[PDB]
C-alpha cells in the first residue's frame, strides 16, 4: 500500500444519519464492560473502530469507586470493534497513558500515549505497534494532546500538544511525524491565545483543527496546517453562535481574533466543519452544563461575524447528559468526495448523578447525508436506579 493523500474535498452536508452507537452503560449493568472516558473513532484502510481511555476496572466492580479522577497508572488507550461495548474480553490495548491520539497513514497506524506525574510526564510514539520515539515534558505541567484522531498526508502526520497551565498561557507545539519519526516541530503561530484538545479533519491537501480555549474563549480557536510545506496558522471563529461550554448567551456580533468574554477558565472539547456555506458547528444545548447536543448550519461561520443558523438537527435532548465530541472521516471509502462524521460522549455518573460512585460514558456517532433525513434523539439509555 502507498501513503494516503488528501485528494478530495468534503461532500455536501444536508443532514446527519446514525453511524454507530454502543449502549455501553446499559449492557454493562450486567456484563464485563470497562469504565472509560475521552473516546473517539478512527479508520484503517479496511475497518473503522471505537477508541477510548480505560480506567482499569469494570463498571460493576468495586474498584469503580473513585473513577471520577482522570490521571493514574491504571489507564490505557483501548480500541474495540465498531458498535460493540468496550469489553474486558474484546478490547485491544493500544498503549499506556492518560492522554492520547492515533491515526493510519495508508500503510500502517501511529498511536501516541502520555503518562507520568504532572511535573514529569512524557509521550511515547508507537508506529506499527512498536515504540519508536519518546518526548519529555517541556513545561513541566501536564503534557497533553488531542483526545481524538490525527490526520496524515503522504506519510506526514501533524499532531498538536500543549504543556502549561489551563487557566493561563501555555506552550503549544505542532510536531510533524513520518513513520513515528520527528521531521520537525514548531511553536503555535497566529492569533490564537490558548489551544487545548484539537479535533481535526483533512481535505484537499490541507488539515483543519477546531480546538478549546479554556482560559477565556467561548468561541473556538481554529488551526490550519499545510502538511506539504509543514507550516500552519491560527485564528478564531467569527460567528456569534458560541460553541464552548460553559458559555454566555449568544451575542448579535462575534469576534474573529479575540476569544469571547462572559465565561473563562473551563470548557469542553468540540469540533466543526468549515467549508464556506457548507459549514456546520456542534454544541451543547445548555450554557451551564454538558446536557444536550445539536448541529447547526451556519454559513461562513469562520469569516462572517454576524452569521446565524440556517438549518439544524438535534442529536441529544436537553434533559440528557453529553460531553466531549470530535471529528473523523473514512478516508478510504469509495466515492467522489469525503463524507463528514463525528461522535459525542454520553457521560453517566458523577458529578451530575451522585447516587453512584463512578463515572463512565457511551458513544453515539453520525455521518453526513446529501439527503434531508428526519431526525431522532440518541441518549445513553441506562437507568441509574438499577445500579443502586
Amino acid at each position, epitope marked *: 500500500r502507498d501513503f494516503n493523500n488528501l485528494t478530495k474535498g468534503l461532500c455536501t452536508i444536508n443532514s446527519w444519519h446514525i453511524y454507530g452507537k454502543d449502549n455501553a452503560v446499559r449492557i454493562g449493568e450486567d456484563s464485563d464492560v470497562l469504565v472509560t472516558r475521552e473516546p473517539y473513532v478512527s479508520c484503517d484502510p479496511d475497518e473503522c473502530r471505537f477508541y477510548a481511555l480505560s480506567q482499569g476496572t469494570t463498571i460493576r466492580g468495586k474498584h469503580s469507586n473513585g473513577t471520577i479522577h482522570d490521571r493514574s497508572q491504571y489507564r490505557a488507550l483501548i480500541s474495540w470493534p465498531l458498535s460493540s461495548p468496550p469489553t474486558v474480553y474484546n478490547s485491544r490495548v493500544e498503549c499506556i497513558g492518560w492522554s492520547s491520539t492515533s491515526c493510519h497513514d495508508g500503510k500502517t497506524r501511529m498511536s501516541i500515549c502520555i503518562s507520568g506525574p504532572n511535573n514529569n510526564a512524557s509521550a511515547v510514539i508507537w508506529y506499527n505497534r512498536r515504540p519508536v520515539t519518546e518526548i519529555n515534558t517541556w513545561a513541566r505541567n501536564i503534557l497533553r494532546t488531542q483526545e481524538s484522531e490525527c490526520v496524515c498526508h503522504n506519510g506526514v502526520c501533524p499532531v498538536v500538544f500543549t504543556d502549561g497551565s489551563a487557566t493561563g498561557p501555555a506552550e503549544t507545539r505542532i510536531y510533524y511525524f513520518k513513520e513515528g519519526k520527528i521531521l520537525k516541530w514548531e511553536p503555535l503561530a497566529g492569533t490564537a491565545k490558548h489551544i487545548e484538545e484539537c479535533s481535526c479533519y483533512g481535505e484537499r491537501a490541507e488539515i483543519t483543527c477546531t480546538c478549546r480555549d479554556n482560559w477565556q474563549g467561548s468561541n473556538r480557536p481554529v488551526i490550519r496546517i499545510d502538511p506539504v510545506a509543514m507550516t500552519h496558522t491560527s485564528q478564531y471563529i467569527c460567528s456569534p453562535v458560541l460553541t464552548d461550554n460553559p458559555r454566555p448567551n449568544d451575542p448579535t456580533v462575534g469576534k474573529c481574533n479575540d476569544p469571547y468574554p462572559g465565561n473563562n477558565n473551563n470548557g469542553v472539547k468540540g469540533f466543526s466543519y468549515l467549508d464556506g456555506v457548507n459549514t456546520w458547528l456542534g454544541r451543547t444545548i445548555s450554557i451551564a452544563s454538558r446536557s444536550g447536543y445539536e448541529m447547526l448550519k451556519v454559513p461562513n461561520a469562520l469569516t462572517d461575524d454576524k452569521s446565524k443558523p440556517t438549518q439544524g438537527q438535534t442529536i441529544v435532548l*436537553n434533559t440528557d447528559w453529553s460531553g466531549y465530541s470530535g471529528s473523523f472521516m473514512d478516508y478510504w471509502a469509495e466515492g467522489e468526495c469525503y463524507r463528514a462524521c463525528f461522535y459525542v460522549e454520553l457521560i453517566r455518573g458523577r458529578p451530575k448523578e451522585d447516587k453512584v460512585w463512578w463515572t463512565s460514558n457511551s458513544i453515539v456517532s453520525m455521518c453526513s447525508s446529501t439527503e434531508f433525513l428526519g431526525q431522532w434523539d440518541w441518549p445513553d439509555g441506562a437507568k441509574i436506579e438499577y445500579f443502586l
Partner: antibody
Framework: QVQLQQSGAELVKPGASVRMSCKASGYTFTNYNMYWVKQSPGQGLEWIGIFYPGNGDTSYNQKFKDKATLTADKSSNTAYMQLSSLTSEDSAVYYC???????????????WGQGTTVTVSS | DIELTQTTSSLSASLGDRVTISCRASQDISNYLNWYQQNPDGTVKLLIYYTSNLHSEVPSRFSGSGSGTDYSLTISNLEQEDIATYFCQQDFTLPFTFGGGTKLEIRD
C-alpha cells in the same frame, strides 16, 4: 395560572440549619429552571443558584456554594432550599422565581413567590 | 461578574407625569437586560425582558430601551399603583446580577 407558594417565616438561633419550600402550580414543573434569590439590607438582590427538576441539574453562585443546597420533590411539585450553619449574616428575605425561558437561561424570571423571611439570632 | 448600576435610588414625582429610570452595565451585555417591580408589600413582577419586550398583562405605559451598556425604562403617565422600587437585571452570562433599585415616590 402559575402560582408559587413558599413556607413561613423562620426564627432561628446561630448555628442552625433551615429548609424552606416553594410549591409550584399551574404549569409543568419539569420543564422550567427554578431560581433562588436573596434580598437583604445593605447587599440587595443576589442570585443563589438553579435547580432543573427535569434532570436534576444544579449550579450555584460561588458566593453561596457551601451555604445553600438545592433539592426538589417532583411528585408534590415542591422545590426546597436548605441553608446551613446559620449566622446573622443570613437574616434576610428569600425568593424562588421561575425561568421565563423554560430550560434556557434567558427570558428573565417571569413569576416569583412572595418570599420567606429567615431571622437568625440568639 | 457584570456589575449593574442604577443611577439615583429615589425618584419623587407627581401623578400623571413621565419618569425615566436608568441602568448601566460594566460591559456589553448584548441587550440581555430585564426590569422588575417590587411592590411595598413584597410582591415582585417582571415588566420588560430583553431590553424592550413586555411581559403579558403589563400596562402599555411601561417601555424600555438601550444597547451596549446603557439601558432605560420609561413610564409615560404615572398612576398611584406605580409606587414601587424598580430593579434591572442581566442574563447575558452567569451568575445573574441585579441593579441597586430605584425607589419611586409620588411626592405629596
Amino acid at each position: 395560572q402559575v402560582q408559587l407558594q413558599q413556607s413561613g417565616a423562620e426564627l432561628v438561633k446561630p448555628g442552625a440549619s433551615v429548609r424552606m419550600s416553594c410549591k409550584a402550580s399551574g404549569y409543568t414543573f419539569t420543564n422550567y429552571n427554578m431560581y433562588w434569590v436573596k434580598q437583604s439590607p445593605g447587599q440587595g438582590l443576589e442570585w443563589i443558584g438553579i435547580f432543573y427538576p427535569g434532570n436534576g441539574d444544579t449550579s450555584y453562585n460561588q458566593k453561596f456554594k457551601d451555604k445553600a443546597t438545592l433539592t426538589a420533590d417532583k411528585s408534590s411539585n415542591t422545590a426546597y432550599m436548605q441553608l446551613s450553619s446559620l449566622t446573622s449574616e443570613d437574616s434576610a428575605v428569600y425568593y424562588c422565581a421561575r425561568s421565563g425561558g423554560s430550560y434556557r437561561y434567558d427570558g428573565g424570571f417571569d413569576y416569583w413567590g412572595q418570599g420567606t423571611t429567615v431571622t437568625v439570632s440568639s | 461578574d457584570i456589575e449593574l448600576t442604577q443611577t439615583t435610588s429615589s425618584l419623587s414625582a407627581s401623578l400623571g407625569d413621565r419618569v425615566t429610570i436608568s441602568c448601566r452595565a460594566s460591559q456589553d451585555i448584548s441587550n440581555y437586560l430585564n426590569w422588575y417591580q417590587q411592590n411595598p408589600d413584597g410582591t415582585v413582577k417582571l415588566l420588560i425582558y430583553y431590553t424592550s419586550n413586555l411581559h403579558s398583562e403589563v400596562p402599555s405605559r411601561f417601555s424600555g430601551s438601550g444597547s451596549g451598556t446603557d439601558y432605560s425604562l420609561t413610564i409615560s403617565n404615572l398612576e398611584q399603583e406605580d409606587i414601587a422600587t424598580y430593579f434591572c437585571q442581566q442574563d447575558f452570562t452567569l451568575p445573574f446580577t441585579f441593579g441597586g433599585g430605584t425607589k419611586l415616590e409620588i411626592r405629596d
